Amino acid sequence: KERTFLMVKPDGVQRNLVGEVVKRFESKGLKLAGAKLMVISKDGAAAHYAELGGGPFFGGLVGGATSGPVFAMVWEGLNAAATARQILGATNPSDAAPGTIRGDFGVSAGRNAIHGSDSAGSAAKEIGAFFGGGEAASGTPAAAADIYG
Amino acid sequence: KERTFLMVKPDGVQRNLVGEVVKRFESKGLKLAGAKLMVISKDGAAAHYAELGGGPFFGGLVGGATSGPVFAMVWEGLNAAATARQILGATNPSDAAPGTIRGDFGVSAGRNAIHGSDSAGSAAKEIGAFFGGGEAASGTPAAAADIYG
Amino acid sequence: KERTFLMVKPDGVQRNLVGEVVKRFESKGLKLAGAKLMVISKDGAAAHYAELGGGPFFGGLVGGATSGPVFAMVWEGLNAAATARQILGATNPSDAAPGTIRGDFGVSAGRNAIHGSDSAGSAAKEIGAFFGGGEAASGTPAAAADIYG
Amino acid sequence: KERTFLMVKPDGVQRNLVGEVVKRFESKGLKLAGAKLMVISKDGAAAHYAELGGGPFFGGLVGGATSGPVFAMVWEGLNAAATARQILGATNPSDAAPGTIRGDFGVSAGRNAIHGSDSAGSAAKEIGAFFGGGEAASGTPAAAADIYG
Amino acid sequence: KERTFLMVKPDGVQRNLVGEVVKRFESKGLKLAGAKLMVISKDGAAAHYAELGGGPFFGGLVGGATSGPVFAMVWEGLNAAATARQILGATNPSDAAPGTIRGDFGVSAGRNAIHGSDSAGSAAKEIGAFFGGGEAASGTPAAAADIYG
Amino acid sequence: KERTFLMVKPDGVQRNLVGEVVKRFESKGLKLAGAKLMVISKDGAAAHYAELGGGPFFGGLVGGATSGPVFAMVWEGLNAAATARQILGATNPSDAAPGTIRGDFGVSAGRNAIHGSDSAGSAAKEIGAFFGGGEAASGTPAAAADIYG
């Protein structure tokens, strides 16, 4: 059903947390509709982080995402985006509820393992910028009935 | 260093084993140079499974990979391909050493979670068919020194 | 000490979460006094879900529990029932604290992995309906001293 | 399909390994057709361990199983029994392949976490003695197609 | 950076939770600057628990820590102490957020797996009493850059 | 019972594998009689690696252990040393059975997570060099009866 864009920032990829962060959502019910390693290459960054470019963080923020790769993803299911952030954790890892990808694998707001949509609109603008339309498989997960109803 | 192509067959994707199977190699040292959900779409299959197309299995084998998506990947490091198959497990999951992706998550030779190169040549022909050349990030993993020397 | 009835609804059994959901309480301290796979068989349902039978959910709720099996259990220890629900999670999995059997393995209020008593009375009426009196082992766990005092 | 009897000896129940040992087979594909906590109560022992009652071990062997409870189970699937012992591990835990329930959770041949059939006949005589015929659910696991074919 | 004293009380050591409790902080980013098994030996206790010695708990509290060993540790990083207690969990395990060392491995306020500083001062007085000054390695963790910035 | 010296080489400490590597033996039955972070400081190295100092590896081998810290340990139980190496894994991680600390967390013979005695004599000479005699707790693990007999 509803889709959501969420990727693993350079740090997590480097901290070998790719697998777990993917898995967390698999064993949750969220469905992986597309995912790859497309780097930010600066240009892709500035736009994505376009909001508040005048803020000092940009200088040191756009520096980060652009270093190592970025495993980008798109996940399905009802309330996929709503629930994602809940388990993604609070933005600040040193303030994020223990049990989340952040409160379990993150000690700094600078580079906190993953990233994920803050609304369906932000979701419907992130998928596009990073993915496309064909890179996404429209596979029906053989196990989805034992989740919704 | 050496690269290797290895993907999660439709079954594992469906059995929610995407994360673990990725993670296994992260916590091993293997480096994820590119990865996405590009389906087999028949044509991509027949070629990949080209070997022994005259064998009856093809009828029922090419049927499998083509159902659900396929998380394809390319991994780095020394002896990446050599070691991969070792931990990938024996082909038959009901005969594969307990500790592997197969002997831990597989009961049938038909659909056994993942797939992975059987030699550097087979590796240097699988990467190409499924990936390309640009989809691969040439990121230097900040943690590779604590592995090799 | 205090006992509590808590089972894994059809969904979790089907979602292969039997082991983890059992284990969660083992590594917590709760003691497994009896457990099996006794299906609801409709009659057993209607009574258990007797409360608010006039509510529309019953139509579609009693349909659920009755499909696949149900691993029923009874757990011991002080505050067993009080603490259980806390770690069982909120009723709604898309609203349940990340770290629980629900917020980690559930995306719908319809079928949320497990079920567990809401009070000592409800506990002292669920055990009976599903278990009996002899199916329960009165074993003294050799490791209980390192928990209470 | 084929069924198999396998229980967790008193030790494992006490060592809180109930959950994991159950889970191992869930994430493998084996299907839990019935399971409870029926103690050995001596009589049930002597018969089960009937073979080589004249051997000194019986004195100290029948003493063991009869202490704490015993989570008995019956598992399904093709080659269920054949494969089970493989992942159950070698009889001697201080000689059992690392990755198994024994080589991971056992240091003595005396009490090694679990027990499991040594042949289909031994399987078709253990189920009966410990279970019955009605305690077993004939549920069709909604996820079995993504395993066999 | 900032250091913090936190040990595993006798119970956890006995409950085999040493590894996990250590690991939790490793995969968090906290750095292990020194750690061993120095028992409380009464004298070391009374001082550490000096606060409220007139309270009845002391009788039964100092009895506890002094039984089995105690894996003491000192951890590094920014907000190490601040964040530690958050993931250490609430003092009462039957009231501590599920995801913590306490809410996951503890059912009694008496003996709750681990112990950890309640302020930088309390941290700068616990390290000393249990460690020294030379037992601490001043190693620079080759992976710290992918955490802070 | 029998004791054994086994530490985590600089690499593993750096690769955040301290916890797991400790835990592996806890959930096995091995008892932690003492453990800390005492660095090799060259002198401690040369002696320990004294054997084959004339071999070229020494140049580049003694360089390794001396970089980051080293969590040294001493473990108890029957066949502690015999069984340890089995689960420690083969010396070469790219040849070590999948399920071990090496075959799961190691890709190079140079730096392979941990180290552990090759005989009771080598065990009775490693403990001494790294530990002492007082740093070891003679605690009786409250859970040892459910293992041996």
Short mmCIF file of N, CA and C in Angstrom, two decimals, chain A residues 12-20 22-39 67-69 71-72 134-143, chain B residues 12-20 22-39 67-69 71-72 134-143:
data_model
loop_
_atom_site.label_atom_id
_atom_site.label_comp_id
_atom_site.label_asym_id
_atom_site.label_seq_id
_atom_site.Cartn_x
_atom_site.Cartn_y
_atom_site.Cartn_z
N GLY A 12 25.93 4.58 8.79
CA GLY A 12 25.45 3.23 9.01
C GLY A 12 26.03 2.20 8.05
N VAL A 13 26.15 2.59 6.78
CA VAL A 13 26.70 1.73 5.73
C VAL A 13 28.12 1.36 6.18
N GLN A 14 28.83 2.37 6.66
CA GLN A 14 30.19 2.22 7.15
C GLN A 14 30.23 1.46 8.47
N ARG A 15 29.20 1.63 9.30
CA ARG A 15 29.13 0.95 10.60
C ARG A 15 28.54 -0.46 10.46
N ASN A 16 28.52 -0.98 9.24
CA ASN A 16 28.03 -2.31 8.92
C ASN A 16 26.59 -2.61 9.36
N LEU A 17 25.81 -1.57 9.63
CA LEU A 17 24.42 -1.74 10.07
C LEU A 17 23.41 -1.85 8.92
N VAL A 18 23.89 -2.09 7.71
CA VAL A 18 22.97 -2.20 6.58
C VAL A 18 21.92 -3.30 6.80
N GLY A 19 22.39 -4.54 6.95
CA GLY A 19 21.52 -5.68 7.17
C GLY A 19 20.45 -5.51 8.24
N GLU A 20 20.86 -5.22 9.48
CA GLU A 20 19.92 -5.06 10.60
C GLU A 20 18.85 -4.03 10.25
N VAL A 22 17.81 -3.06 7.50
CA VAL A 22 16.89 -3.53 6.46
C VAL A 22 15.92 -4.48 7.19
N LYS A 23 16.49 -5.54 7.76
CA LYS A 23 15.77 -6.57 8.51
C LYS A 23 14.70 -6.08 9.48
N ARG A 24 14.99 -5.00 10.21
CA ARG A 24 14.06 -4.47 11.18
C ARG A 24 12.67 -4.31 10.58
N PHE A 25 12.63 -3.80 9.36
CA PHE A 25 11.37 -3.54 8.69
C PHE A 25 10.78 -4.79 8.04
N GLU A 26 11.63 -5.76 7.71
CA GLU A 26 11.14 -7.00 7.11
C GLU A 26 10.29 -7.75 8.14
N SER A 27 10.88 -7.95 9.33
CA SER A 27 10.22 -8.64 10.44
C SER A 27 9.15 -7.79 11.10
N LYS A 28 8.86 -6.63 10.50
CA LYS A 28 7.83 -5.72 10.98
C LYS A 28 6.62 -5.88 10.07
N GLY A 29 6.89 -6.07 8.78
CA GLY A 29 5.81 -6.24 7.82
C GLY A 29 5.98 -5.33 6.62
N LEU A 30 6.79 -4.28 6.78
CA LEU A 30 7.04 -3.31 5.72
C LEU A 30 7.65 -4.05 4.53
N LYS A 31 7.23 -3.69 3.32
CA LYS A 31 7.72 -4.37 2.12
C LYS A 31 8.70 -3.56 1.28
N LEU A 32 9.86 -4.16 1.03
CA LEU A 32 10.91 -3.53 0.25
C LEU A 32 10.61 -3.44 -1.25
N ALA A 33 10.06 -2.30 -1.66
CA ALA A 33 9.78 -2.05 -3.07
C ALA A 33 10.96 -1.21 -3.55
N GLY A 34 12.00 -1.90 -4.01
CA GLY A 34 13.19 -1.23 -4.52
C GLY A 34 14.22 -0.75 -3.51
N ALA A 35 15.49 -0.90 -3.86
CA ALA A 35 16.57 -0.49 -2.99
C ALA A 35 17.93 -0.67 -3.64
N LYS A 36 18.79 0.35 -3.54
CA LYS A 36 20.15 0.29 -4.09
C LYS A 36 21.16 1.18 -3.37
N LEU A 37 22.35 1.32 -3.96
CA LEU A 37 23.42 2.13 -3.36
C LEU A 37 23.76 3.47 -4.04
N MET A 38 22.74 4.19 -4.50
CA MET A 38 23.01 5.45 -5.17
C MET A 38 23.47 6.63 -4.31
N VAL A 39 24.77 6.91 -4.40
CA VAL A 39 25.44 8.00 -3.69
C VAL A 39 24.73 9.34 -3.92
N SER A 67 30.04 11.56 1.51
CA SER A 67 31.25 10.77 1.66
C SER A 67 30.99 9.36 1.12
N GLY A 68 30.65 8.42 2.01
CA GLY A 68 30.39 7.05 1.60
C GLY A 68 29.05 6.85 0.90
N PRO A 69 28.78 5.64 0.37
CA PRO A 69 27.51 5.35 -0.32
C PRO A 69 26.25 5.58 0.54
N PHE A 71 22.46 3.39 1.03
CA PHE A 71 21.51 2.38 0.64
C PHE A 71 20.13 2.99 0.75
N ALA A 72 19.58 3.40 -0.39
CA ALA A 72 18.25 4.01 -0.43
C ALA A 72 17.20 2.92 -0.56
N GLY A 134 10.71 2.74 -12.50
CA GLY A 134 10.91 1.41 -13.03
C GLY A 134 11.77 0.55 -12.12
N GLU A 135 12.62 1.20 -11.33
CA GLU A 135 13.51 0.51 -10.41
C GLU A 135 12.74 -0.17 -9.30
N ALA A 136 11.45 0.14 -9.23
CA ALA A 136 10.59 -0.42 -8.20
C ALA A 136 9.82 -1.66 -8.66
N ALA A 137 9.97 -2.76 -7.93
CA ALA A 137 9.27 -3.99 -8.25
C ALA A 137 7.86 -3.91 -7.66
N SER A 138 6.87 -4.39 -8.41
CA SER A 138 5.50 -4.36 -7.92
C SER A 138 5.11 -5.76 -7.47
N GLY A 139 6.05 -6.40 -6.78
CA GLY A 139 5.83 -7.74 -6.29
C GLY A 139 4.86 -7.79 -5.14
N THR A 140 4.05 -8.84 -5.12
CA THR A 140 3.08 -9.06 -4.06
C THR A 140 3.75 -10.06 -3.12
N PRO A 141 4.10 -9.61 -1.91
CA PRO A 141 4.75 -10.42 -0.88
C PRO A 141 3.86 -11.57 -0.41
N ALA A 142 4.33 -12.79 -0.62
CA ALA A 142 3.59 -13.98 -0.20
C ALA A 142 3.74 -14.20 1.30
N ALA A 143 2.98 -13.41 2.05
CA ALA A 143 2.97 -13.44 3.51
C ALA A 143 2.27 -12.20 4.06
N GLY B 12 13.70 -15.95 -0.38
CA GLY B 12 14.21 -15.23 0.77
C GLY B 12 13.61 -13.84 0.95
N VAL B 13 13.43 -13.13 -0.16
CA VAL B 13 12.85 -11.78 -0.15
C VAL B 13 11.47 -11.92 0.48
N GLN B 14 10.75 -12.95 0.05
CA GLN B 14 9.42 -13.25 0.54
C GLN B 14 9.45 -13.76 1.98
N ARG B 15 10.51 -14.49 2.34
CA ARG B 15 10.65 -15.04 3.69
C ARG B 15 11.27 -14.01 4.66
N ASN B 16 11.24 -12.74 4.26
CA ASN B 16 11.75 -11.62 5.05
C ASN B 16 13.21 -11.74 5.50
N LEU B 17 13.98 -12.60 4.84
CA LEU B 17 15.39 -12.79 5.19
C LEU B 17 16.35 -11.83 4.50
N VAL B 18 15.82 -10.76 3.91
CA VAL B 18 16.70 -9.81 3.22
C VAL B 18 17.78 -9.25 4.16
N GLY B 19 17.33 -8.57 5.22
CA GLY B 19 18.24 -7.98 6.19
C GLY B 19 19.35 -8.88 6.71
N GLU B 20 18.99 -10.02 7.31
CA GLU B 20 19.98 -10.95 7.87
C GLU B 20 21.00 -11.34 6.81
N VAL B 22 21.90 -9.85 4.25
CA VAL B 22 22.79 -8.74 3.90
C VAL B 22 23.81 -8.66 5.05
N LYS B 23 23.28 -8.42 6.25
CA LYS B 23 24.06 -8.30 7.49
C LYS B 23 25.16 -9.34 7.70
N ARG B 24 24.88 -10.59 7.36
CA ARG B 24 25.84 -11.67 7.54
C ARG B 24 27.20 -11.28 6.97
N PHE B 25 27.18 -10.68 5.79
CA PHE B 25 28.40 -10.31 5.11
C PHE B 25 28.99 -9.00 5.62
N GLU B 26 28.14 -8.13 6.17
CA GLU B 26 28.63 -6.87 6.71
C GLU B 26 29.54 -7.15 7.91
N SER B 27 29.01 -7.94 8.85
CA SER B 27 29.72 -8.32 10.07
C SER B 27 30.81 -9.35 9.80
N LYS B 28 31.05 -9.64 8.52
CA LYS B 28 32.08 -10.58 8.09
C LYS B 28 33.25 -9.75 7.57
N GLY B 29 32.93 -8.65 6.89
CA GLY B 29 33.97 -7.79 6.35
C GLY B 29 33.73 -7.47 4.89
N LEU B 30 32.91 -8.29 4.23
CA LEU B 30 32.59 -8.12 2.81
C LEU B 30 31.94 -6.74 2.64
N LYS B 31 32.31 -6.04 1.57
CA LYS B 31 31.78 -4.70 1.33
C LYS B 31 30.74 -4.60 0.21
N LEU B 32 29.59 -4.05 0.56
CA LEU B 32 28.49 -3.88 -0.38
C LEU B 32 28.72 -2.80 -1.43
N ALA B 33 29.23 -3.21 -2.59
CA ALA B 33 29.45 -2.29 -3.70
C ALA B 33 28.23 -2.49 -4.60
N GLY B 34 27.18 -1.71 -4.33
CA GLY B 34 25.96 -1.78 -5.12
C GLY B 34 24.97 -2.89 -4.79
N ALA B 35 23.69 -2.55 -4.84
CA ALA B 35 22.63 -3.50 -4.54
C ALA B 35 21.25 -2.91 -4.76
N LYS B 36 20.37 -3.67 -5.44
CA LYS B 36 19.00 -3.24 -5.70
C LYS B 36 18.00 -4.38 -5.86
N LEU B 37 16.78 -4.05 -6.30
CA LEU B 37 15.72 -5.05 -6.47
C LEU B 37 15.33 -5.41 -7.92
N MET B 38 16.31 -5.50 -8.82
CA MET B 38 15.98 -5.81 -10.20
C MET B 38 15.54 -7.24 -10.52
N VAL B 39 14.23 -7.38 -10.73
CA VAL B 39 13.57 -8.65 -11.07
C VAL B 39 14.24 -9.33 -12.28
N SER B 67 9.13 -15.00 -10.23
CA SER B 67 7.95 -14.63 -9.47
C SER B 67 8.21 -13.30 -8.75
N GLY B 68 8.61 -13.36 -7.48
CA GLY B 68 8.88 -12.15 -6.71
C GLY B 68 10.19 -11.47 -7.07
N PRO B 69 10.46 -10.28 -6.51
CA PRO B 69 11.70 -9.54 -6.79
C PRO B 69 13.00 -10.31 -6.46
N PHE B 71 16.85 -9.20 -4.64
CA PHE B 71 17.80 -8.22 -4.17
C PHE B 71 19.17 -8.67 -4.62
N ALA B 72 19.66 -8.06 -5.70
CA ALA B 72 20.98 -8.40 -6.25
C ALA B 72 22.04 -7.57 -5.54
N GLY B 134 28.01 1.77 -13.41
CA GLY B 134 27.81 3.04 -12.73
C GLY B 134 27.01 2.88 -11.45
N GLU B 135 26.18 1.84 -11.40
CA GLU B 135 25.34 1.57 -10.23
C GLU B 135 26.17 1.18 -9.04
N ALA B 136 27.46 0.95 -9.28
CA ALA B 136 28.38 0.54 -8.22
C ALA B 136 29.15 1.72 -7.62
N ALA B 137 29.05 1.87 -6.30
CA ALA B 137 29.77 2.93 -5.59
C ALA B 137 31.19 2.45 -5.33
N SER B 138 32.16 3.35 -5.50
CA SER B 138 33.56 2.99 -5.27
C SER B 138 33.99 3.56 -3.93
N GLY B 139 33.10 3.43 -2.95
CA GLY B 139 33.36 3.93 -1.63
C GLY B 139 34.38 3.10 -0.89
N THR B 140 35.22 3.79 -0.11
CA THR B 140 36.23 3.14 0.70
C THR B 140 35.63 3.06 2.09
N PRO B 141 35.32 1.84 2.56
CA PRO B 141 34.73 1.56 3.87
C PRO B 141 35.66 1.96 5.01
N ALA B 142 35.21 2.91 5.83
CA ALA B 142 35.99 3.38 6.97
C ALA B 142 35.91 2.37 8.11
N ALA B 143 36.69 1.30 7.96
CA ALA B 143 36.77 0.21 8.93
C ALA B 143 37.46 -1.00 8.31
#
